[PDB]
Amino acid sequence: MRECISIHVGQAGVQIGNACWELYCLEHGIQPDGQMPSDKTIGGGDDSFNTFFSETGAGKHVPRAVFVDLEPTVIDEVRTGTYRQLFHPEQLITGKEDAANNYARGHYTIGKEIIDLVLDRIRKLADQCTGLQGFLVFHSFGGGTGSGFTSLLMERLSVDYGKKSKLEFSIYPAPQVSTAVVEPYNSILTTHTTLEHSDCAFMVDNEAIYDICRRNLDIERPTYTNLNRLISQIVSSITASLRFDGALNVDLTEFQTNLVPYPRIHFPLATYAPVISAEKAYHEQLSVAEITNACFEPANQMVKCDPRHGKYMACCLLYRGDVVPKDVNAAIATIKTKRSIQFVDWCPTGFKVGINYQPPTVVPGGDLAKVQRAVCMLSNTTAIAEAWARLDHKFDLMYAKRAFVHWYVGEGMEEGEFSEAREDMAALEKDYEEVGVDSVE
Amino acid sequence: MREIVHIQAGQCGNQIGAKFWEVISDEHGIDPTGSYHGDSDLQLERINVYYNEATGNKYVPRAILVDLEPGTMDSVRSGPFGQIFRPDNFVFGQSGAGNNWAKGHYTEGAELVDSVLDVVRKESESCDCLQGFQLTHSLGGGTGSGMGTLLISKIREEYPDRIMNTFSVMPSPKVSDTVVEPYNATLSVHQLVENTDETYCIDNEALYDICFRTLKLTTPTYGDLNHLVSATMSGVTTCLRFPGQLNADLRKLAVNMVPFPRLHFFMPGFAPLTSRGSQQYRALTVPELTQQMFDSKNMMAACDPRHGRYLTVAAIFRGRMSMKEVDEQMLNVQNKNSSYFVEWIPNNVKTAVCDIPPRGLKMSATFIGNSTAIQELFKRISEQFTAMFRRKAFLHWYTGEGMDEMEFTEAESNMNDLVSEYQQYQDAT
Amino acid sequence: LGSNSQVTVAVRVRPFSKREKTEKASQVVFTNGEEITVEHPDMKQVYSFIYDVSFWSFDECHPGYASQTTVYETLAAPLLDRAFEGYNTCLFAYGQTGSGKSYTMMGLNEEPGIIPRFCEDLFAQIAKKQTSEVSYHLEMSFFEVYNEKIHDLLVCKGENGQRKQPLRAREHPVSGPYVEGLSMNVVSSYSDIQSWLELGNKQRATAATGMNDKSSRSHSVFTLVMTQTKTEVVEGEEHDHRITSRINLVDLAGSERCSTAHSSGQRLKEGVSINKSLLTLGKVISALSEQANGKRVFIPYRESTLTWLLKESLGGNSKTAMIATVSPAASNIEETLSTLRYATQARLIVNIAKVNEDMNAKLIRELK
Ligand SMILES: CC(=O)O[C@H]1C(=O)[C@@]2(C)[C@H]([C@H](OC(=O)c3ccccc3)[C@]3(O)C[C@H](OC(=O)[C@H](O)[C@@H](NC(=O)c4ccccc4)c4ccccc4)C(C)=C1C3(C)C)[C@]1(OC(C)=O)CO[C@@H]1C[C@@H]2O
Numbered sequence A: 001m002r003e004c005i006s007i008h009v010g011q012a013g014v015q016i017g018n019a020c021w022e023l024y025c026l027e028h029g030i031q032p033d034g035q036m037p038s039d040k041t042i043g044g045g046d047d048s049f050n051t052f053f054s055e056t057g058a059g060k061h062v063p064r065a066v067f068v069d070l071e072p073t074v075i076d077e078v079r080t081g082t083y084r085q086l087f088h089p090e091q092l093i094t095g096k097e098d099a100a101n102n103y104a105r106g107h108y109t110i111g112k113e114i115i116d117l118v119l120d121r122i123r124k125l126a127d128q129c130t131g132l133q134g135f136l137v138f139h140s141f142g143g144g145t146g147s148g149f150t151s152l153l154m155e156r157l158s159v160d161y162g163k164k165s166k167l168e169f170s171i172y173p174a175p176q177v178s179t180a181v182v183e184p185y186n187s188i189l190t191t192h193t194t195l196e197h198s199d200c201a202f203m204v205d206n207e208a209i210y211d212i213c214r215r216n217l218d219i220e221r222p223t224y225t226n227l228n229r230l231i232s233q234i235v236s237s238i239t240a241s242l243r244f245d246g247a248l249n250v251d252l253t254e255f256q257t258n259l260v261p262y263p264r265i266h267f268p269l270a271t272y273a274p275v276i277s278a279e280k281a282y283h284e285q286l287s288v289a290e291i292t293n294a295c296f297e298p299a300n301q302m303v304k305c306d307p308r309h310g311k312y313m314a315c316c317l318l319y320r321g322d323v324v325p326k327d328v329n330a331a332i333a334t335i336k337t338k339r340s341i342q343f344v345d346w347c348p349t350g351f352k353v354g355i356n357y358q359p360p361t362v363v364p365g366g367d368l369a370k371v372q373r374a375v376c377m378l379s380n381t382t383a384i385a386e387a388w389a390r391l392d393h394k395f396d397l398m399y400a401k402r403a404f405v406h407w408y409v410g411e412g413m414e415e416g417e418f419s420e421a422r423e424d425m426a427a428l429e430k431d432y433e434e435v436g437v438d439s440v441e
Numbered sequence B: 001m002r003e004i005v006h007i008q009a010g011q012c013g014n015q016i017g018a019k020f021w022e023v024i025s026d027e028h029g030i031d032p033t034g035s036y037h038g039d040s041d042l043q044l045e046r047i048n049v050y051y052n053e054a055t056g057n058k059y060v061p062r063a064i065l066v067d068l069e070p071g072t073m074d075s076v077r078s079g080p081f082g083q084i085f086r087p088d089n090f091v092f093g094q095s096g097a098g099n100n101w102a103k104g105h106y107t108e109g110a111e112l113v114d115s116v117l118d119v120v121r122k123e124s125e126s127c128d129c130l131q132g133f134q135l136t137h138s139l140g141g142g143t144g145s146g147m148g149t150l151l152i153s154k155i156r157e158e159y160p161d162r163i164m165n166t167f168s169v170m171p172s173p174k175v176s177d178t179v180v181e182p183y184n185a186t187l188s189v190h191q192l193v194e195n196t197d198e199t200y201c202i203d204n205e206a207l208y209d210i211c212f213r214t215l216k217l218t219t220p221t222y223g224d225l226n227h228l229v230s231a232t233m234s235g236v237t238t239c240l241r242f243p244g245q246l247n248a249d250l251r252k253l254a255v256n257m258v259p260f261p262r263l264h265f266f267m268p269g270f271a272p273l274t275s276r277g278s279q280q281y282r283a284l285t286v287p288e289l290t291q292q293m294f295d296s297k298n299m300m301a302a303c304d305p306r307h308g309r310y311l312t313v314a315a316i317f318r319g320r321m322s323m324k325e326v327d328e329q330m331l332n333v334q335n336k337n338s339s340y341f342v343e344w345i346p347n348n349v350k351t352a353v354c355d356i357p358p359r360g361l362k363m364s365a366t367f368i369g370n371s372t373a374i375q376e377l378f379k380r381i382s383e384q385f386t387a388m389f390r391r392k393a394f395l396h397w398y399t400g401e402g403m404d405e406m407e408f409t410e411a412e413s414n415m416n417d418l419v420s421e422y423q424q425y426q427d428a429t
Numbered sequence C: 001l002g003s004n005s006q007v008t009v010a011v012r013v014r015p016f017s018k019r020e021k022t023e024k025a026s027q028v029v030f031t032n033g034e035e036i037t038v039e040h041p042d043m044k045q046v047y048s049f050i051y052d053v054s055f056w057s058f059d060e061c062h063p064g065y066a067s068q069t070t071v072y073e074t075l076a077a078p079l080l081d082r083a084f085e086g087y088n089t090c091l092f093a094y095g096q097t098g099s100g101k102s103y104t105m106m107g108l109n110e111e112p113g114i115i116p117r118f119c120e121d122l123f124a125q126i127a128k129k130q131t132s133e134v135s136y137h138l139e140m141s142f143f144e145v146y147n148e149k150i151h152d153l154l155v156c157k158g159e160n161g162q163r164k165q166p167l168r169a170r171e172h173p174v175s176g177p178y179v180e181g182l183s184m185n186v187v188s189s190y191s192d193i194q195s196w197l198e199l200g201n202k203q204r205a206t207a208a209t210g211m212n213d214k215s216s217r218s219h220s221v222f223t224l225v226m227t228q229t230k231t232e233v234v235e236g237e238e239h240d241h242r243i244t245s246r247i248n249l250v251d252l253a254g255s256e257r258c259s260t261a262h263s264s265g266q267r268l269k270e271g272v273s274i275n276k277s278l279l280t281l282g283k284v285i286s287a288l289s290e291q292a293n294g295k296r297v298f299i300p301y302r303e304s305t306l307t308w309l310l311k312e313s314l315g316g317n318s319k320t321a322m323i324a325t326v327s328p329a330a331s332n333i334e335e336t337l338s339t340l341r342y343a344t345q346a347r348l349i350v351n352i353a354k355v356n357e358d359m360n361a362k363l364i365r366e367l368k
């Protein structure tokens, strides 16, 4: 059977993970105590789907997850919260010191002393599987942990496991909003390392969702307990085809093939169209077309990057609920007719489609409404080169004076590693340009 | 006794084949337990074609089920007619091909095909006289395109004198469903062209138009599209199961339809299709079907036959009819529309008539056509193909599994040559 | 490509057989020197044909007797001349069953055919022009077609119930079709050529039939690759200009009706395969002869491994010669007529031969 390991690293990972397993438990009928009263009421069924939850003989269902912070605060919310009786107590809080938003701290100094435990519990989880399909790493650029520890880990797994899909779900740093001075360095450092080991890194920025919740959900002052519920849904659609029935099922090695033309341009975006409040759940039809067109609106992207400044290479559309295929085909044609959406000449197909019959579920206490159908888009565009350039210019402005560097050297980093990582992102800026040049003869 | 092996590969073949066994089980009076609850006796004389017999007067279909994910299979088991299949013939694995032809052919499917063939070698030896094989798969994915064509080469080498009749869903022109359709289809066409006798090219875009214009279905699901294909699969082998005036079989259709060994790609069709509310306004007559058969808009191939010439077509009728009404009408088509027919084949029409129609229709018809308008399907893929291959768009996932750039060029030349072999017969000079 | 080399056709009338003496067969094929006349025994209708060359091995003492060495010195020696010039060359046989194709090409130990004379004359010509300026490199291969599968004749099998390891054919974009895995052996002398040929002919498939007690039941292609490495007047590296040439000598099998050579099973199967290959070859010859008259025509190269691997010889880029072999018995007049018709149709073929300098798009291109 199909089995995936969800890893959450740092604070941006955990607070997302707490929202995900909140949702995974509801879709499958699991209480926070790991129990499933419906199955003993039913007498059958594998709704306790062994993709995300392992099962013991006593009826308790235990999630396939490991998450670690290198500080004990955020996990300790889980070891004393409402989901304590769900998880395995082997959660890593060997975080007596934090990474101080330093790569050099999550990659070396405190980058070790914690990793041998992490690889062991994973190896235990993998030894309980009848077949793996890949990993799901939830982290954040900008920190030391989500940047450094994520890189060291991705290096080791590429040795022990090798050819297994590794899908990252990371918080991309925003152009204006930012909660740290040294974000540009930490992003360029792990981006250099994770490039040769990852397979597809799904980008999200916190600045776009602030506007989505404003314009669509009509929330005027949201916090991270809202941004992380939407991110919980993007993942469910990706991993829905491994749990529930469907017409056109999509495995995890299918994103790796259709959305990654060349091995270094595996940075796609994401979004979720029918993000509406309960009130606006009326007054609208929410058909396949109205939902599918919204995914191509530049204002409904979960990353701050205008795709109209670039060209599309590949787009995977994952539908859920009461959806009929002809409605998808009619809609995808309407998009290729519109001229503001330019595709590369070397990809005349462009689109992938996936359809499922299990609609999304409503986390109670939430802001999203109940719908019959829901859509998740994943796109690879040349516009994101603009965002790589913003980081490189911030890098150069404050590296020309060697600012904040003595905090990284103080941990074991060399002065040259900054250059070695700035040159690889100047080659990436060209590869995104070379791809976008239409061919000639 | 003539017998057929059915093989269901992928998400498209199994979702069709399940309806095929849901359709055939109706004509032969079999219930989901495998028991017979029929009325007539002609439902049992030739039940050995598709089914095998069991102990307590139960009938197990001679079907084989293959995939690289268990989701497709559990749907069959958890369905209307799931119990009849031999549970030892659900062959599967994990970690699907990922829409990579390289993974279905060389890497993963190669570690499962040996189990598949052992089920084939069992069923075939249990038969008295094997006529051919029946594969239902899709082009555009990895499993159906890789694991299918892998089985085709193996069965062809083991059983080279038998027919390999292959039903295949081709990629649509307007909207794709995978990005790497042209890479996967071109490599599959390189294998089918050399290792089959007749393959029926179906396209999902056309089936949407059939449901839209004729059946007036504006919410058609995949269970309805396969409800059309399954009909054609039944009409072809009708004269192997039921009696008729002028019989036919898979080998006889091939001989007339296939003048040269490579031009065995067909544009199927089926009549009489109509709306549920507009059935009491037409007269069901043989000329009503021929007008519906040779209509440009009832072909499941997504190619206009009016953009070419018919090389030779076929027409399998079912029901009480008059053979004058059949042969006179096929003649009127040839003489009227003489420009859409080859000049150096004086009669481009084969016919077949069965005396046993479908469960609830006075008569039915099935149409099989070989035209030069299939040129547009292989030509379209090549333009997609070379534009991607000229810059190596998605190639590094295929080379990583043990393929070379040479194998892509071979599939392109052979496809492009077939495009010319069909075009050699469109000009009249 | 500034040339047009017409395919050179020859005909050889073999003598009466044991079978055709036991059955009192008459004589229906005659010559007047260069033309070939055929007569139906019913005295109803006469046909005539004209070829570039015609041989008469019907009787030893007759006038115009073209022995084995005369056939060689008329057909194969110019092919060696062009091979030394730098062209690719092809010589292929054709005819019905028992016509004497294997005899004409390979021959017997006491009557060596075209191959043991071609290779020997090649080595002899080399021994006189192996001067300090130019060196030579020779490779050989010898492969077989049997039930549309490819086999190598110059390996020593294992020991099993099945020891015919089949190779596959591939299409290189520039060099055209070729065989994957074929042992190409480097050669030094005519004695090594003879050893390899003995091994190959002992490995080739044969069988007793009603028209040949030792029948040639598989197509055979003999490939030589000759590279002349010459030297320019150089201030630096010597031995810096190479020319390559491929010589393909092909012995095909005969039609053979299933009723005359009555035998069931594997014999019938391989006869059917042979017949199919010959049909496809005929289609190819007719299509090329129609190309020669200015029409747009498609050549079915891909319908058989034989024509697919000979794509560059029946057309393409090499100087080609055909040897039709016929029988004078009246009982085989129809097959003789079919062979002669295909042969005279082949004279209209025109191939664009070029010199394989391996200098175009390098320097001689813009030099000239
Ligand atoms: C009796 C009845 O319910 O009325 C008709 C009917 O309303 C119409 C619309 C039927 C109906 O057509 C459809 O609804 C349909 C929808 C999507 C895709 C395909 C068909 C019918 O389903 C088609 C069905 O015909 C058959 O049952 C044949 O045996 C068909 N098999 C099945 O439909 C079937 C039955 C049980 C389970 C699964 C399939 C068949 C066709 C070819 C070869 C063998 C069998 C019939 C009489 C009808 C219904 C049921 C409405 C027609 O269908 C056919 C086969 O042509 C459309 O025109 C015919 C006859 C009628 O006009």
Ligand SMILES: Nc1nc2c(ncn2[C@@H]2O[C@H](COP(=O)(O)OP(=O)(O)OP(=O)(O)O)[C@@H](O)[C@H]2O)c(=O)[nH]1
Pocket: A009, A010, A011, A012, A013, A015, A016, A069, A070, A071, A098, A099, A100, A101, A102, A140, A141, A142, A143, A144, A145, A146, A171, A178, A179, A206, A224, A227, A228
């Ligand atoms: N979407 C989202 N982002 C978060 C959340 N918590 C932190 N972040 C992001 O994380 C970024 C800073 O990196 P951190 O996640 O704090 O780094 P870390 O993994 O905690 O490593 P340390 O700082 O050493 O503890 C900020 O830009 C935030 O936007 C969260 O709950 N949701």
Ligand SMILES: Nc1nc2c(ncn2[C@@H]2O[C@H](COP(=O)(O)OP(=O)(O)O)[C@@H](O)[C@H]2O)c(=O)[nH]1
Pocket: A247, A248, B009, B010, B011, B012, B015, B016, B096, B097, B098, B099, B138, B139, B140, B141, B142, B143, B144, B169, B177, B178, B204, B222, B223, B225, B226
């Ligand atoms: N007609 C029809 N086609 C289908 C259906 N499901 C999938 N397909 C087609 O099959 C292709 C998907 O390839 P698939 O074999 O499922 O990929 P795989 O699961 O990795 O082997 C798409 O091009 C679809 O058009 C179906 O139910 N009906």
Ligand SMILES: Nc1ncnc2c1ncn2[C@@H]1O[C@H](COP(=O)(O)OP(=O)(O)O)[C@@H](O)[C@H]1O
Pocket: C014, C015, C057, C096, C097, C098, C099, C100, C101, C102, C103, C104, C212, C214, C215, C216, C254
């Ligand atoms: N010119 C010839 N002189 C003597 N014998 C000949 C001549 N031509 C053919 N034969 C005889 O014909 C027989 C068959 O020749 P062969 O080349 O094996 O025919 P196939 O075309 O079947 O290979 C040989 O045994 C040979 O003796």
Ligand SMILES: [Mg+2]
Pocket: A010, A011, A071, A098
């Ligand atoms: Mg933290």
